[PDB]
Design a protein around this ligand. Structure first.
Ligand SMILES: [Mg+2]
Ligand SMILES: [Mg+2]
Length: 342
DNA sequence: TCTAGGGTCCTAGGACCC
DNA sequence: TAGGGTCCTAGGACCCT
């Protein structure tokens, strides 16, 4: 009983939308990201910019040093949300078994699909073609028997391509697969694994589950499982958002409580507006604040609270400011709510 | 170069309950 | 009756763009 999992992933999503809506941007290096003066980072870049080394999460000052002609865009999030809604509606034409992971990607379980003669390869191709036909954006896709391999596979033939891993091909694929390619294995984990001589899934296959469990806890079981292609996580179409946050990094650090309070006055109506979209009565489980300091340590303090309330967020930020700032500049202020459970 | 803003999930100590 | 359970909370790795 092998499943058929597709992972669909839009190509250079934000930049692809901006190029479609303004073809003057198609052939020059562009990126969505905050300006160097706004102390921004790159959200994403198109391929002309990626050629210079520009990457997501790169500080904008670095991207502009690599690519002096980089054209920087602020982002049009309703445009991306509209594209997201459209591709999820296209997914629904093939299956209801859809787990979105972000605006531009989703897992599909097409095990029980009768479309395209049961071929997940052809379903993926048809989805990608339909997306191009109806949105004039391209997507890539990965097909595999489990989630994480499908998600890895969708990167292998990007842009505008796809890659299929059959069960017969899984062992050879895993043997030299870098651990850092597994979603959830990030820089810190890959470095700790590298330092004990573990770089690939083939390396972890030579390890004892008990050792990994002592050395990493539950993460060690996930590493053990993924390194032999085990991933029983079902595609789940019923996940719901659990939190809403609004935060801003200032162009210059602030050093005075008056400046912090003034920023919160701007953030609060935005938090209220976004909460009201999903919870019109503003009823919540917790609310709280975030400060990030000029040396990049960050603190959050949140608490049980029944309904979004500005004065309590200001009061809480004042306590955090007085108690934890230690004369440092503050580069970021944020507000936060935790939503009621169901 | 100088480090975003939207989030999910896991950990772990103490409070609290029995 | 010596420890078994379950929330509150802060922090941090990690994910997407
Ligand atoms: Mg993408
Ligand atoms: Mg994606």
């Amino acid at each position: 009983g092998s499943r058929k999992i597709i992972h669909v992933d839009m190509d250079c999503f934000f930049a692809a939308v901006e190029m479609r809506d303004n073809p003057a941007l198609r052939d020059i290096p562009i990126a969505i990201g905050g300006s160097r003066e706004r102390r921004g980072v790159i959200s994403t870049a198109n391929y002309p910019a990626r050629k210079f080394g520009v990457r997501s999460a790169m500080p904008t000052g670095m991207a502009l040093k690599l690519c002096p002609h980089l054209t920087l865009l602020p982002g049009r999030f309703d445009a991306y949300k509209e594209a997201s809604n459209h591709i999820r509606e296209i997914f629904s034409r093939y299956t209801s078994r859809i787990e979105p992971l972000s605006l531009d990607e989703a897992y599909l379980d097409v095990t029980d699909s009768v479309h395209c003669h049961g071929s997940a390869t052809l379903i993926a191709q048809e989805i990608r073609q339909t997306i191009f036909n109806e949105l004039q954006l391209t997507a890539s896709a990965g097909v595999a028997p489990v989630k994480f391999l499908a998600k890895i596979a969708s990167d292998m033939n990007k842009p505008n391509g796809q890659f299929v891993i059959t069960p017969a091909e899984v062992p050879a694929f895993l043997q030299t697969l870098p651990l850092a390619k597994i979603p959830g294995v990030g820089k810190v984990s890959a470095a700790k694994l590298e330092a004990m001589g573990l770089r690939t899934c083939g390396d972890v296959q030579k390890c004892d589950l008990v050792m990994l469990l002592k050395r990493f806890g539950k993460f060690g079981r996930i590493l053990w499982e993924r390194s032999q292609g085990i991933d029983e996580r079902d595609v789940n179409s019923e996940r719901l958002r659990k939190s809403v946050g609004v935060e801003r990094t200032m162009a210059e650090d602030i050093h005075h409580w008056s400046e912090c309070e003034a920023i919160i006055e701007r953030l609060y109506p935005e938090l209220e507006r976004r909460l009201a979209k999903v919870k019109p009565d503003l009823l919540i489980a917790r609310q709280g604040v975030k400060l990030k300091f000029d040396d990049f340590q960050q603190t959050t303090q949140e608490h049980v609270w029944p309904r979004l309330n500005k004065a309590d967020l200001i009061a809480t930020a004042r306590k955090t400011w007085d108690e934890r700032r230690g004369g440092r500049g503050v580069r970021l202020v944020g507000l936060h709510v935790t939503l009621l459970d169901p």
